[PDB]
Amino acid sequence: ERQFHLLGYVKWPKEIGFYNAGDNFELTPQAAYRIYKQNCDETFWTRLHNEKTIIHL
Amino acid sequence: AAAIAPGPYRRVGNIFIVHCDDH
Amino acid sequence: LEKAWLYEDSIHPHADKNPRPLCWTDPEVKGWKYRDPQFIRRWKPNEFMH
Amino acid sequence: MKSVFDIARSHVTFPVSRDGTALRRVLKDWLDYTECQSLQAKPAFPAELCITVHPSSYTKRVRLLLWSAVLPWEVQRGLSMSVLEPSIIPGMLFVMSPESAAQGLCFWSGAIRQPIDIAFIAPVEPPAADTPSFSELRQRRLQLSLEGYDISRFFPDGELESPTVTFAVQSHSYLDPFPDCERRYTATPEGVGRGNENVRYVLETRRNLLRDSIRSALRECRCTHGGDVEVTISLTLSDELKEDLREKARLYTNYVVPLEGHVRRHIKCLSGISPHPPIIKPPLPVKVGTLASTRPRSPMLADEAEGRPTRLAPSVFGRHDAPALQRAQQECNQLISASALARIPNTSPRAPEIPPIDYEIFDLCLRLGLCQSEAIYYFYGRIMREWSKELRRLRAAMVLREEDVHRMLRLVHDPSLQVPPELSACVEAVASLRKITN
Amino acid sequence: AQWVPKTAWKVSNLNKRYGPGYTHMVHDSHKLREKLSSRKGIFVIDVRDPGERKLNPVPRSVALHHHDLLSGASCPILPQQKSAAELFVLASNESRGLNSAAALRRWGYDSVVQVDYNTLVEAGYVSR
Amino acid sequence: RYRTAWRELLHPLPVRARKMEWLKRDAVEENEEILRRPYYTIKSYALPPAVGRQEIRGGMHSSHSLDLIMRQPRRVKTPEQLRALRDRLRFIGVTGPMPQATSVSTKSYTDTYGSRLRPRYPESWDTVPPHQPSRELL
Amino acid sequence: YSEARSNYDGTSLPAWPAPGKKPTYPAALSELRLPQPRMRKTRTEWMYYHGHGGCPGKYGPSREIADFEYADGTPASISGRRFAFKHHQDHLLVQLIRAAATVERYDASGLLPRIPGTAEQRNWDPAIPLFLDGTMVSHVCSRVVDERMGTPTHTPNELANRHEGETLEANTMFATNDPSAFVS
Amino acid sequence: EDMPLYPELRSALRQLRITTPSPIQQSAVEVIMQRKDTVVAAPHGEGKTL
Amino acid sequence: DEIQRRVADRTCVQEQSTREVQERWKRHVVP
Amino acid sequence: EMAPELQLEYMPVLFTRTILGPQGGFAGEERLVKLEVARKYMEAGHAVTPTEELRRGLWCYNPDTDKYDCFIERNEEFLDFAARKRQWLDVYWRVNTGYLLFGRQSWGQGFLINCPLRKRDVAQKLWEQYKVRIDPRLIEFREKDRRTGIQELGHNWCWLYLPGAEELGINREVYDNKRVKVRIHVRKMNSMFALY
Ligand SMILES: Nc1ncnc2c1ncn2[C@@H]1O[C@H](COP(=O)(O)OP(=O)(O)OP(=O)(O)O)[C@@H](O)[C@H]1O
Numbered sequence A: 001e002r003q004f005h006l007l008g009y010v011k012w013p014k015e016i017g018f019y020n021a022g023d024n025f026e027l028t029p030q031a032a033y034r035i036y037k038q039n040c041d042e043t044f045w046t047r048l049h050n051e052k053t054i055i056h057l
Numbered sequence B: 001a002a003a004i005a006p007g008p009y010r011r012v013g014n015i016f017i018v019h020c021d022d023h
Numbered sequence C: 001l002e003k004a005w006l007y008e009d010s011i012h013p014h015a016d017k018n019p020r021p022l023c024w025t026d027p028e029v030k031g032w033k034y035r036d037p038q039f040i041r042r043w044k045p046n047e048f049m050h
Numbered sequence D: 001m002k003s004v005f006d007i008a009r010s011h012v013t014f015p016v017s018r019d020g021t022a023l024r025r026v027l028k029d030w031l032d033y034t035e036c037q038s039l040q041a042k043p044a045f046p047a048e049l050c051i052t053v054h055p056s057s058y059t060k061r062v063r064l065l066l067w068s069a070v071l072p073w074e075v076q077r078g079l080s081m082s083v084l085e086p087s088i089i090p091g092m093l094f095v096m097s098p099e100s101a102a103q104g105l106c107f108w109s110g111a112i113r114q115p116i117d118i119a120f121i122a123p124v125e126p127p128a129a130d131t132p133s134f135s136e137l138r139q140r141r142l143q144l145s146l147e148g149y150d151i152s153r154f155f156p157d158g159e160l161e162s163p164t165v166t167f168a169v170q171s172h173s174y175l176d177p178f179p180d181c182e183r184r185y186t187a188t189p190e191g192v193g194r195g196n197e198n199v200r201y202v203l204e205t206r207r208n209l210l211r212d213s214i215r216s217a218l219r220e221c222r223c224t225h226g227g228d229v230e231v232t233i234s235l236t237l238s239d240e241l242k243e244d245l246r247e248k249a250r251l252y253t254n255y256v257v258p259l260e261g262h263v264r265r266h267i268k269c270l271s272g273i274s275p276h277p278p279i280i281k282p283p284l285p286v287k288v289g290t291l292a293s294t295r296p297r298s299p300m301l302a303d304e305a306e307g308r309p310t311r312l313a314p315s316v317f318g319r320h321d322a323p324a325l326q327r328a329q330q331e332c333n334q335l336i337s338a339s340a341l342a343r344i345p346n347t348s349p350r351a352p353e354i355p356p357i358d359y360e361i362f363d364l365c366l367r368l369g370l371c372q373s374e375a376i377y378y379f380y381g382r383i384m385r386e387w388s389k390e391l392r393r394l395r396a397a398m399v400l401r402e403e404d405v406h407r408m409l410r411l412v413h414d415p416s417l418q419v420p421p422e423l424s425a426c427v428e429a430v431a432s433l434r435k436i437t438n
Numbered sequence E: 001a002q003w004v005p006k007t008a009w010k011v012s013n014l015n016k017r018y019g020p021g022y023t024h025m026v027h028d029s030h031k032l033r034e035k036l037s038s039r040k041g042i043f044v045i046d047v048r049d050p051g052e053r054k055l056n057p058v059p060r061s062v063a064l065h066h067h068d069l070l071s072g073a074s075c076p077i078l079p080q081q082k083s084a085a086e087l088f089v090l091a092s093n094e095s096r097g098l099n100s101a102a103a104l105r106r107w108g109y110d111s112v113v114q115v116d117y118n119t120l121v122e123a124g125y126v127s128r
Numbered sequence F: 001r002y003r004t005a006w007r008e009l010l011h012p013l014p015v016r017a018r019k020m021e022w023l024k025r026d027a028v029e030e031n032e033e034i035l036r037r038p039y040y041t042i043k044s045y046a047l048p049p050a051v052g053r054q055e056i057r058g059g060m061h062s063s064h065s066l067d068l069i070m071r072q073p074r075r076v077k078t079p080e081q082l083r084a085l086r087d088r089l090r091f092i093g094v095t096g097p098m099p100q101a102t103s104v105s106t107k108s109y110t111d112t113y114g115s116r117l118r119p120r121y122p123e124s125w126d127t128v129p130p131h132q133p134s135r136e137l138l
Numbered sequence G: 001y002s003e004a005r006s007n008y009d010g011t012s013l014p015a016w017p018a019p020g021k022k023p024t025y026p027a028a029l030s031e032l033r034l035p036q037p038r039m040r041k042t043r044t045e046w047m048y049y050h051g052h053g054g055c056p057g058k059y060g061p062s063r064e065i066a067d068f069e070y071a072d073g074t075p076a077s078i079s080g081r082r083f084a085f086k087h088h089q090d091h092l093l094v095q096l097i098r099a100a101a102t103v104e105r106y107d108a109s110g111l112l113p114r115i116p117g118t119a120e121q122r123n124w125d126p127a128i129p130l131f132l133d134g135t136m137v138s139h140v141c142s143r144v145v146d147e148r149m150g151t152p153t154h155t156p157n158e159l160a161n162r163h164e165g166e167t168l169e170a171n172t173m174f175a176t177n178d179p180s181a182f183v184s
Numbered sequence H: 001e002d003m004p005l006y007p008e009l010r011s012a013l014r015q016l017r018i019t020t021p022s023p024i025q026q027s028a029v030e031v032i033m034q035r036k037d038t039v040v041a042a043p044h045g046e047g048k049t050l
Numbered sequence I: 001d002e003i004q005r006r007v008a009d010r011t012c013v014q015e016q017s018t019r020e021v022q023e024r025w026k027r028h029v030v031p
Numbered sequence J: 001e002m003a004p005e006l007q008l009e010y011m012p013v014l015f016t017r018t019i020l021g022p023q024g025g026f027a028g029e030e031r032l033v034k035l036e037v038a039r040k041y042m043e044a045g046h047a048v049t050p051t052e053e054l055r056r057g058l059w060c061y062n063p064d065t066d067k068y069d070c071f072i073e074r075n076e077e078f079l080d081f082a083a084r085k086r087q088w089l090d091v092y093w094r095v096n097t098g099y100l101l102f103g104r105q106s107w108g109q110g111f112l113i114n115c116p117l118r119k120r121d122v123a124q125k126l127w128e129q130y131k132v133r134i135d136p137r138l139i140e141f142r143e144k145d146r147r148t149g150i151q152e153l154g155h156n157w158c159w160l161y162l163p164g165a166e167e168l169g170i171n172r173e174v175y176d177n178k179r180v181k182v183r184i185h186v187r188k189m190n191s192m193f194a195l196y
Helices: A002-007 A029-038 A047-056 D004-011 D021-036 D072-077 D098-102 D132-143 D209-217 D221-226 D239-271 D299-303 D322-332 D338-343 D359-368 D372-396 D402-413 D421-434 E006-014 E029-039 E050-055 E066-071 E094-106 E117-123 F002-007 F015-035 F064-071 F079-086 F109-113 G043-050 G080-109 G119-124 G137-149 H007-015 H023-033 I002-007 I019-029 J035-044 J052-056 J076-097 J119-130
Strands: A017-019 A025-027 B009-013 D045-054 D058-069 D089-095 D116-124 D166-175 D201-206 D230-237 E044-046 E061-063 E087-090 E112-115 F040-044 G171-174 J010-015 J030-034 J057-062 J067-073 J100-104 J132-134 J155-161 J179-188
Touching: A025 A029, A029 A047, B009 G080, D004 D021, D004 D239, D021 D072, D021 D239, D021 D359, D045 D209, D045 D239, D058 D072, D058 D209, D058 D239, D072 D359, D089 D239, D116 D209, D116 D230, D132 I002, D166 D201, D230 D239, D239 D359, D239 D372, D299 F002, D338 J076, D359 D372, D359 D402, D372 D421, D372 E006, D402 D421, E029 E117, E066 E094, E087 E094, E094 E112, G119 J119, G171 J076, J010 J035, J030 J035, J052 J057, J076 J119, J076 J132, J076 J179, J100 J119, J119 J132, J119 J179
Parallel strands: D058 D089, E044 E061, E044 E087, E087 E112, G171 J132, J100 J179
Antiparallel strands: A017 A025, B009 F040, D045 D058, D045 D230, D089 D201, D116 D166, D116 D201, D166 D230, J010 J030, J057 J067, J155 J179
16 A cells, blocks of 8 residues: 555546456546546547547447 | 723732652 | 464365454554645635625 | 836846946836836736535636736735726735745735725645645656746746646635725735645735625525535636736746845945955965865764864964063064954954945835845934934934935835834924924 | 735844944824823833832823833733733833833833823823 | 764664653753743732733643633722721631620630630541640640 | 542532533643643543542542441541541641742742842843842851852853953843744 | 063063063962962972062 | 656657647637 | 942053953943053053043054054944944854853763754853853754754854844954854763753
């Protein structure tokens, strides 16, 4: 837990994302769609962001 | 309330309670 | 000392004893400091002279 | 419109390091901009006041035109001798220093024409972005920044560039004008933001603006209560307003600090402070040390040479009697006794020459906030002594000119400033006995 | 506007050449009289010799010693509201007046004005 | 910081001992602060005694009732009331005669039972009377 | 039966608040004048707070209340140690009364000075402001104790040689009026 | 010259042809001028008389 | 934001070809 | 005002040259100095007998040309300025001349102190054995002492900054008119004067 909080990662609820069997941070498709709906028109959003949202869906 | 306390004045001293804390 | 059963693996023949899992808290739980974050203050309608 | 940037573009040519009249002209022009120009003639920039309604959401925004006060004269003047009104609501935005914010911020109704409502706000970051990792990232970015202003005093958190920061009103208060120029005359933040280093922005505007806006925003509140509601007040700045704030901070950092240094040098010059074989061997300057000679004998003795004299010690090269030693001391002008050397200093007995008091510079510093502490420390005692002596002469019945008397009388009767009561009373008594008014 | 602190003006006393000492000696009789007649209370403390204050009695005045004032033995008698309270130190010696003013400032009373017996008489606070 | 790194190795006491020594220093400073107070304090008859007090806040202390008594206004308002209460104060074991202003038939306990005789006091754990009335005479 | 008194009269403060109101809690921190360090009260400090001076069985109800009584209500007898404890309480009260009477007679005679502290304390502590304008073996012992404990340190003879009667004067050119310099 | 002497004593020293004080005179002259009971201890022939 | 600010120091083109377009889209759609 | 039996041991003296010490004075001061000290001063030439014309005006020592050709009229403001400059030079001389002794406790024969010395204690000892009232803010510890203090047992020192020197013109005679070197000596004293 000390190393986790030192690197600076956050414990999100399971509805958002979680560390899967390979300890990779997998993001929920619902969470990805909501992140898209919020950050549609931001400056950093890109074609690759839309592609990854479709990938998660 | 912004003025000096009226009436006569009484002088009040003090007393000490001393407790020995070391040998 | 004989009341200790040491097994380098999880396999042990003490299944008929039903050993209850022993849970102990390490006394070192200090964070050594914790400053509270700054949050946006929430105001009440009657607070503004009402 | 006349702006501080135009004033600096005009002052670009005045030689301040070589002349004193040019520095006086610069201070006079800044005093003209501060007192002779109208607040309506000074440029303003738009901003919005968001009010989020949480039932436990509805948001209402108000159009505000804010005057930015970043320079010291603007900050100390405020809404003094000016009016807000001669769909958008006028206002004034004060940007304080972290040094002054760590201390208790206190505002006062100094020569205001209208009762004002002030709001102490702070730039707050979301909790997810408020972690020490993002804080360290912001610190590294500010250290690597190439901007003009000093990051230590102006925006030490990057709230102008942070995409997630929001300027939240952490406290509010009001200021009522004095009965002479037109019941709380002072205001300090309380509750949340008490002694907070993040509360560095003040917003002065029309009285009861917050309450009126909250009342106009709360419309469903009646039904939600008939069938507890919270309010969140935040301030959003336009891009042009943020650019003006950044430009004022840069102008401060790059112009006022050298201007303050020139004012300090001028005050020092006006106070009189200007920068710069025999048997007895006198003290001589230590020879220049080589690499190994300057290198100590041990790494622990590196701090031993912290405090060392730059001159050697006097010495006697032989064994002599007392009359011979005294004759040698008299011939070499060097005493042997360290006690005698310490007790008999070679100092000038006359007082250093000091030019007369510059009431113009004193008044300019007191009215512009530039080197105010230096001006006080260097001239307050002189002025008090001169006026006390003149008052003694007048009571027993000059050196004090009528122009200086008029300047001091105006400075004392200025409502926008506060002078000590002893100085005010002394000036008033001297004027009343010398038959000088206004 | 931002309020300049009262302690910002204390940097003048740090001048080693024109320091205060190493002075409210001038008062308009009419102004002092109207101020006292508007206050209508006990705001005058006289710090002077007992024989002196017996020779020149001043009613409605508090007879205290400057050493007591400096030590703080008169704090419960002091007005206890150091903001709005203004005190008048009556001393025949200007040095004693300055010392009493310094003691009151140390205990938290900045609004302290030094008055003279002749000034008080010509203002009419002391009856005859 | 070689000198500091070397000084860190030089310590006669552990951290707890150093903390105790610093607490002792704070106690000495408290004694000095208490001794720096004046000998007396000029007060008034009307105002409560806890008005000119020079002074871990918000919680109740062991002197709560004492502070309440010090904060409540004084019960003797004027020296006239002071003397009107003190003149009726009577001393029994005082050496000397006492007046008979009010009543004549009323005799004193000593006038009735001499000076060597005492009333039989109930002697119990709660009632401890002054045994041996002859030891009290110097 | 059973007796429970924390006071001589048996009176006390209301132990319980009004129904539905927040209670009052004692100060948990040790009563140290400095704001830091902050330390929770020890058990001995809590005993001192609640009135049992130091340890249990001393200056509290556990010692003042009678140990037993007969079933018909008859109280116990007076023990010698009980009489000694009553005399000890009387001795404390007599100490208090005599000290207060001494202070009162000193104030009446005018022996209480207007300057706080003694001359040694004024010469040692700079936080105090400047106030300007039979047998004899025991007496000799007091005099030598005073001579040994009056001046703990001397001014170096290089500045003022005390053998010639030279003394230094107070140089208050860099002094301050506010006590915050010594308080903080 | 560092010790206080009257002009008549200065002339007496010049008459006796004495300029520099001996170690006993450097120490004992000051103590006696302070009016203290002094024990002037020095070897033979060091100016103990003066 | 931190990524973009650290990349723009050693970026290829010094102009605002794409970032100004992104800012225009934001200013036109978001508010 | 001094009693005659005491004043018999003094004599009025006008100081021609500034002299630091308990029996010294600034140039142009009328001072009652002891008999022997005044004799030494008048023999060295640093003082004269206060005649009336001398009290009006007196020639003082000029350090620029090393002669007594600097005439000075004794005025009120001049006496004030000279008294203040003399106070500054006197406190500098007191602080820079001798040591400052601190008797403290140290468990065993260690090298450090139990409770480190702070600016409050330094100012306390300054006032105690030098009769100098300052505020602790003017004291500056060394770089190795910024963290803890004078915890080291033995010979130590710190800086004492004296701000008001340029207004008085004390930049030439003093080696450093901005700060003084306060030699401090800490001694392990377990006697009654430990208190720590
Ligand atoms: N400062 C001086 N310089 C040179 N000569 C000196 C000085 N003082 C004393 N003398 C000479 O030293 C001689 C001896 O002096 P003095 O009689 O004091 O010695 P003494 O110690 O008394 O010897 P003794 O103990 O044998 O009597 C004298 O004749 C004197 O001239």
